[PDB]
Amino acid sequence: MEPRAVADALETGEEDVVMEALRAYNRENSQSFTFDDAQQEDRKRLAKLLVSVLEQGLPPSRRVIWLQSIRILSRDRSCLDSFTSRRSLQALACYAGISASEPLNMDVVLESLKCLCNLVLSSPVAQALAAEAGLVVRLAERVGLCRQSSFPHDVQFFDLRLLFLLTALRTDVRQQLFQELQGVRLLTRALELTLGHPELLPPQETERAMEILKVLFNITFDSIKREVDEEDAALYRHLGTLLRHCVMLAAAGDRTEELHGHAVNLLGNLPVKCLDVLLTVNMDVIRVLLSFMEKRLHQTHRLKESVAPVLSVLTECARMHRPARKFLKAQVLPPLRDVRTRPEVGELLRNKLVRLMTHLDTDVKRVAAEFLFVLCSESVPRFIKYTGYGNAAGLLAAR
């Protein structure tokens, strides 16, 4: 019932009573991540006892109830440091099957992955220990299996989430997954196998694909040089074809906008040349991207992170393709009939973009200015006529 009671049971208790106490605690606290700051010493003692039992070795019959219990104690930042040790993380990686050093229960694997993700997300010591242990190698191996791997959606999704956490918090793990393991091709293959040409995407496949896109965004944004080779170019073109399929794909559960957002954020980091696959008149992909941008313009709090990647992608598309530039100019800047209305007055797309040119974020200002500049075929008088001096001064002073 109480943490001190369970800790005293685990200290002085037989085989059945400790398991019954942990079972009753897990059943009654499976929906509780917060704890009162009064039983903190008892919780720390229980956590240290559980860590001592974990480093010693758990019996194969008593793991699911144990790890889950640990998960309940992983929800406490005070007890968090009691679990973050090299021996404890080695035991967790061995129970998760990701240690470099036997049958496997999928519930055990899932609970171990949940505990590892909770520790890495909450402890820099835990994320550094995971970086030192090199769990990313075996994680990438298990993910790249994919074909003969009949692992459940929970295990796959939490492997992807652990990869996301490791590549977001540890730059060394991020670079090791990109350069040494060549994780770009592995994740591209995993995304291609996750998509299969189905009309709708299931919820499990949608979650897994969004996690793959997040990991790709974490590993590909500052690791690609300006000039690439033929193999990397072909791999990025295949990834761009997959992302174009995603943009033209709808996801179930009303997650299609989130999936398109993740795919566009991933597109925003690819080499500009590799954007040639967005066109292979036939501007359906560009129309979907423009509609996505027009819908994302309604965001005000997260406006930058919402519309910067799509605006950059459309800017690079209009810069590298004359037909795409003409199409975007015809769809955004039509020939003006009545020139009495100011560019900063109105609720049209042009007026919204002009108001965004005076946003509080200089990055948003410059991105919108460059986008509207490459739409006017890089014509200074046309850009000043469509936008106005009060809005184009930021771009004019930048160059």
Numbering used by the authors: 1 to 101, 107 to 201, 208 to 291, 304 to 422
What does the paper say about this structure?
In both structures, ~400 N-terminal residues of Ric8A were packed into a classical armadillo fold consisting of eight ARM repeats (R1–R8). This suggests that the contacts within the crystal lattice are not responsible for termination of the armadillo fold after R8. Thus, Ric8A contains 8 ARM repeats rather than the 10 that were initially predicted.
Notable among these are the resistance to inhibitors of cholinesterase 8 (Ric8) proteins, which regulate G-protein biology in species ranging from slime molds to vertebrates and, in contrast to GPCRs, act on monomeric Gα subunits. The interaction of Ric8 with GDP-bound Gα stimulates release of GDP, leading to the formation of a stable intermediate complex of Ric8 and nucleotide-free Gα. Although the GEF activity of Ric8A and Ric8B was initially thought to account for the ability of these proteins to positively regulate G-protein signaling, mounting evidence suggests that the Ric8 proteins can also serve as ubiquitous chaperones for Gα-subunits.
